[PDB]
Design a protein around this nucleic acid. Structure first.
Ligand code: ZN
Ligand code: ZN
Lengths: 120, 120
RNA sequence: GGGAGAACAACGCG
RNA sequence: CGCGUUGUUCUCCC
């Protein structure tokens, strides 16, 4: 429905249709397209929490921006799963993503069977 | 009733009985005793608002502390009236003044006629 | 990654 | 002085 942009450099991030919610907190982003739009550097200090094990940090790929976008994690069998930081993004036109969520219907809950279809 | 202490150095500030509220926001402190417990240096940037004209900044007199306590102002005919910064103080016992206010009854509203009695 | 907490430095309105 | 906002640091829980 609505598009997210890098809060810092406003480059296209992803669509709300491509987001899923795991355990009513974490925002992950489906599709291999998205992965072209960020780069990753390894985590200084390891943390596992919830289902997740942390793998790396996400940064806007725009070299002049490198805004902190979130982390990648392994959840269940799904590795290199990008989880985005909701304060790091804004919406196309203006308002930020936090605000947007508050006034819109819930995003889709992550569905493992759907996920097993996209990443067999 | 309850005593306020310099948040930084814990030196005795004033009693809650010596505080008055002007326009449901500003906390001023009666009595010439109090004035011995802070020092002032003129205000770096003069601003009038509400009734007040700013005169100076307040600092804890303890030379090793000099915590920012608030400002002095002229209101109506009353010059060099100390207004304290509620985040700068804590309560004897520990909790801070902000917290204390939230769980206690309202402090006394400033009364100009009372004030005309103390400072004729 | 989400939820809180405290500190510092500043920006805006009165 | 109140109010609202930012950046950063430290920490807790998950
Ligand atoms: Zn960017
Ligand atoms: Zn002090």
């Amino acid at each position: 429905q609505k598009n997210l942009l890098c809060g810092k450099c406003k480059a296209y991030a992803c669509s709300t249709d491509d987001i899923r919610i795991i355990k009513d907190s974490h925002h992950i982003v489906l599709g291999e397209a998205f992965k072209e739009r960020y780069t990753t550097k390894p985590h200084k200090k390891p943390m596992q929490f919830d289902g997740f094990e942390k793998k790396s940090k996400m940064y806007c790929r725009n070299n002049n921006c490198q805004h902190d976008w979130g982390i990648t994690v392994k959840y269940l069998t799904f590795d290199n799963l990008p989880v985005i930081k909701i304060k790091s993004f804004v919406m196309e036109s203006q308002m930020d993503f936090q605000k947007w969520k508050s006034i819109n219907s819930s995003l889709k809950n992550f569905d493992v069977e759907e996920m097993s279809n996209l990443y067999p």
